[PDB]
Design a protein around this ligand. Structure first.
Ligand SMILES: N[C@@H](CCC(=O)N[C@@H](CS)C(=O)NCC(=O)O)C(=O)O
Ligand SMILES: N[C@@H](CCC(=O)N[C@@H](CS)C(=O)NCC(=O)O)C(=O)O
Lengths: 208, 208
């Protein structure tokens, strides 16, 4: 039913994969090697010439966040009403912004900018700690009483930053208990421990 | 009912403003000067320390695309069903990606990178021409049979690029007729000609 076409890395597919796994959904991984990509055919066929590419039946989607919102809508991980939907988006857009900065660091200037980035990290993470503190004392999910696609995206963002800068969550008790709690969810826990996840690099240039 | 808190520029609020105007909605513009911003209070109160800030009743939102999707949901500019909603997102995410590149050029290296950017423009615009060609011959809207929040965002993206690189749409007949057509919509036409729009700079550093 579901098919994700992507390079052999976690990157922009980690979140949607966690979502599918934690939601007990089944999907096909179509791995695209750098050689196959350099060939040019596939790329030229991609709407924006990039991956991931997602297939739900004959519905073909591009853009990682479009995929997340699509699954969020179809799997009921988008809040209970319009107001909640807006809050979920607000969280996901914030996650996306930080992911872009992370991606820029990793691929553009890991060596030179890693110091400043880590220094500015606390200020970038604080918003999510604040969101949690304003939602049932940070005991449930990021913004509503049920898990949303934004939670999976946030969870990944947090996991990869703990690798980039160990202990970055030590200053944020809600985020820490949040990561621990969500990572404990049965299907998600099993997935995160699987080779399918563990044996794929976070990024494509060996940096993390 | 609606209130947009932003700097005195079109920037990331141009699209939502066109949407509100074309939809016959009323809103309050709360202008934030650079001096008021440098003061720090407001910024510290912003979820991600940035503007725009949007208020719909006591619902406070941040993130321009969250605002667009919120209005799209509440005003019925998000398609008719889930599949269409996904297609609308796919378009908006593409617009967002190019906007980010545009924003980087304008604020990061207008002088040095303007040449390469313009050179790469055609390849960045082509995806939208393609989207139009696959939707009722490009006679209606960007992806579905009704206007969506993504249309307004795309329209703005196109308008500002024609300023950055005059004639960039000459190679794309569907996009051209698209811009002309949407700009002709009564309420939108009146808005675009108003001082409210015309007398605000596109960006904040005087570059365009
Ligand atoms: N906004 C897109 C970004 C997609 C993207 O950056 N794709 C990269 C891999 S992470 C890619 O296809 N790189 C190869 C290329 O551009 O040819 C999304 O969120 O899906
Ligand atoms: N992802 C955000 C980006 C917001 C943004 O870049 N805001 C700028 C002005 S357009 C800002 O607040 N700059 C001041 C600062 O960050 O200190 C959105 O789409 O709204």
């Amino acid at each position: 039913p579901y098919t994700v076409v992507y390079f052999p890395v976690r990157g922009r597919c980690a979140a949607l994969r966690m979502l599918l796994a934690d939601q007990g959904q089944s999907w096909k991984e179509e791995v695209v090697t750098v050689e196959t990509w350099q060939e040019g055919s596939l790329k030229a066929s991609c709407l924006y010439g990039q991956l991931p590419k997602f297939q739900d039946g004959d519905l073909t989607l591009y853009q990682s966040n479009t995929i997340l919102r699509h699954l969020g809508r179809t799997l009921g991980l988008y809040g209970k009403d319009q107001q909640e939907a807006a809050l979920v988006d607000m969280v996901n857009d914030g996650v996306e912004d930080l992911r872009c900065k992370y991606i820029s660091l990793i691929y553009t200037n890991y060596e030179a900018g890693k110091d400043d980035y880590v220094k500015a990290l606390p200020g970038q993470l604080k918003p999510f700690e604040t969101l949690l503190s304003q939602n049932q004392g940070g005991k449930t999910f990021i913004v509503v009483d049920q898990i949303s696609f934004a939670d999976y995206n946030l969870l990944d963002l947090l996991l990869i930053h703990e690798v980039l800068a160990p202990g970055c969550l030590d200053a944020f008790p809600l985020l820490s208990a949040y990561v621990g709690r969500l990572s404990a969810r049965p299907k998600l826990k099993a997935f995160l421990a699987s080779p399918e996840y563990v044996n794929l690099p976070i990024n494509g240039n060996g940096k993390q």
